[PDB]
Amino acid sequence: MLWHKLPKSIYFRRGSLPIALDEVITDGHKRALIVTDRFLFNNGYADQITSVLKAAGVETEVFFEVEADPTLSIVRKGAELANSFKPDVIIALGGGSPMDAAKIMWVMYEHPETHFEELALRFMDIRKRIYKFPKMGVKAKMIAVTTTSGTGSEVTPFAVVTDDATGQKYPLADYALTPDMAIVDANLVMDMPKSLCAFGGLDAVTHAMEAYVSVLASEFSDGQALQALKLLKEYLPASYHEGSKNPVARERVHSAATIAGIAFANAFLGVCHSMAHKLGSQFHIPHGLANALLICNVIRYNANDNPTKQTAFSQYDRPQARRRYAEIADHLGLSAPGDRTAAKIEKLLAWLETLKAELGIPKSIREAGVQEADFLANVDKLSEDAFDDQCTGANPRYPLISELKQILLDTYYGRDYVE
Amino acid sequence: AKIEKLLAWLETLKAELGIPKSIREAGVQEADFLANVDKLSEDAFDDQCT
């Protein structure tokens, strides 16, 4: 059995933040808490909510203590602040870290008796509905407001928490942590400088390129993935070169980014996802350009006819990983009227590197400022640590350990994966 | 000879303290460095040297 699960209401467009939070004034809440960053609190972005909320009169406060990664102790102080305050509306603002930080400090606010480890053990993935999760939404509810164009963490039920003492990652994922309302505005994002826009643009590119060809791809998220891929090729370079002098392409890039976030929230992600997580978490690389270096090698990694060494149910559901890449390529409008498969694959993967040219990213990991010593020292620390971190995964070809470090070495030197 | 023996020493010191050998290995691209070299060239002249 397969599903399609979304938040209850997604409101969106340019100039829609103050008119969306009128319905929480009308019904019916009186106390509120805001989770955001210190940086946006230093600027005048957090006052745009509090100034509207205090005119009707509600109790508001700001938690601007969010590190770039959640550290499992910030959320403990946040839960202490929350059950000292007792609110019933939690508004998350930002991108990435404040959203899942608010999710984790909300799930421990509804159940202060549950310990973290049984949450870390009972709940690690979906496709496994054993057995159930405690009832939430009883004394509070969550609103999610995005700022950065390119992530979809306001519609996805995912969270990543880093331990302080051991440095241990913990992913949490079940469909009881999606927010109740997602607000998609474009006025909040008009002054971000390049190339912060290009990072999120390539992040949305990879999230939409992956989630079409997964093995969990049902027919309910194919059309939206193809729509997210269609809406970037006209409006991402125009948003990169000028801005905010052209206030048309930026909001369309923003909206297609949250379309991609809707797309991968049901058919899950792949291997370059966790590889980008570990590559960015170790070298302190910003997430978003890590997979932009990897994605062409991953497309080459999946473009093989049929090596039957680690395949599974190859006559049951999946046609071919080649053919769906060909479908992306000739749907996008990049093909002659008379072609074959491999020519369409080549015309597809020739194009995004020409895009990455003017988006202005380095051509390997070494030009991003990564030495040889610590890289070759810890490559076998990462090579199998990126195997058990849920990949599993919906890779069309099941991988093994020594095939990932081939990608990790071919990317750092600036070569291609061909055999 | 004394001057040469002096500046031969702290290069061996920088060896085992583990620091890169030029600015490029620290992670500085060529484009924005050649863009901003004449900005920094005279701006580091008036700034009290003297």
Kindly list the structural domains of chain A, giving each domain's residue range(s) and its CATH number in brackets, ordered by start.
1-193 (3.40.50.1970), 194-419 (1.20.1090.10)
Residue from the list B25, B28, B29 with its beta carbon closest to the beta carbon of A371: B25
CA A251 – CA A13 distance, rounded (Å) = 8
CA A358 – CA A241 distance, rounded (Å) = 9
String of b and e for A183-209 (b: at least 16 CB within 10 Å)?
bbbbebbeebeebebbbbbbbbbbbbb
Q: Which residues of A are annotated as a binding site?
A: 37, 69, 96-100, 160, 169, 203, 207, 273, 287
Beta strands at A89-94 and A141-146: parallel, antiparallel or unpaired: parallel
The strand pairing partners of A10, in sequence order, are A182
Return the closest-CA partner of residue A184 out of A15, A59, A385: A15
CA A266 – CA A130 distance, rounded (Å) = 18
CA A258 to chain centre: 10
Q: Are A252 and A231 in contact (CB under 8 A)?
A: yes
CA A327 to chain centre: 24
DSSP structure string for A125-166 = -SS---S------SS-EEEEEE-SBTB-TTTS-EEEEE-SSS
The strand pairing partners of A89, in sequence order, are A141
3-class secondary-structure state, position A62:
strand
Q: Are A26 and A60 in contact (CB under 8 A)?
A: no
Q: What is the CA radius of gyration of chain A?
A: 22
Q: Are A269 and A394 in contact (CB under 8 A)?
A: yes
**Amino acid letter for position A413:** Y
Q: Are A112 and A79 in contact (CB under 8 A)?
A: yes
Q: What angle do CA A203, A206, A209 make, to 5 degrees?
A: 150
The residue of chain B with its CA nearest to that of A365 is: B27
Indicate if the alpha-carbon torsion angle A228, A95, A97, A368 is positive or negative. Answer: positive
For residue A409, count CB atoms less than 10 angstroms from its CB and return exposed for 0-12, middle for 13-18, buried for 19 or more.
middle
Return the closest-CA partner of residue A202 out of A240, A241, A158: A240
The backbone torsions φ and ψ at residue A41, rounded to the nearest 5 degrees and listed phi first, read -75, -30
Is A371 in contact with B29 (Cβ distance < 8 A)? no
Q: Give the position of tokens 């509120």.
A: A32
The strand pairing partners of A158, in sequence order, are A173
Return the closest-CA partner of residue A295 out of A352, A237, A216, A379: A352
Q: Are A272 and A295 in contact (CB under 8 A)?
A: yes
For residue A133, count CB atoms less than 10 angstroms from its CB and return exposed for 0-12, middle for 13-18, buried for 19 or more.
middle
Return the closest-CA partner of residue A110 out of A90, A129, A96, A130: A90
Using CA atoms, how far residue A146 sits from A171, A288, A356, B22, B41, in Å, is 21, 16, 25, 41, 42
The backbone torsions φ and ψ at residue A42, rounded to the nearest 5 degrees and listed phi first, read -65, -40
Q: Are A48 and A76 in contact (CB under 8 A)?
A: no
Q: Which helix (H) or strand (E) holds A286?
A: none
Q: What angle do CA A381, A384, A387 make, to 5 degrees?
A: 140
3-class secondary-structure state, position A273:
helix
Method used to solve the structure: cryo-EM
Interface contacts (A, B; CB < 8 Å)? 9
3-class secondary-structure state, position A111:
coil
DSSP structure string for A219-269 = TTSHHHHHHHHHTTTTTHHHHHHS-SS-TTHHHHHHHHHHHHHHHTTTS--
CA A268 – CA A19 distance, rounded (Å) = 33
Q: Give the position of tokens 């829609």.
A: A16
A369 token code pair = 């400022």
Indicate if the alpha-carbon torsion angle A397, A232, A192, A13 is positive or negative. Answer: negative
Dihedral angle, C-alpha A217, A176, A91, A86, nearest 10 °: -170
Q: Which residues of A are annotated as a binding site for Fe cation?
A: 203, 207, 273, 287
The strand pairing partners of A159, in sequence order, are A172
The H helix count followed by the E strand count for chain B is 3, 0
> Could you give the angle at which helices A321-332 and A290-302 cross, rounded to 10 degrees?
120
Q: Are A365 and A375 in contact (CB under 8 A)?
A: yes
DSSP structure string for A34-53 = EE--HHHHHTTTTHHHHHHH
A352 token code pair = 């995004």
Is B29 in contact with A362 (Cβ distance < 8 A)? yes
Interface of A with B (CB under 8 A): 362, 367-371
3-class secondary-structure state, position A335:
coil
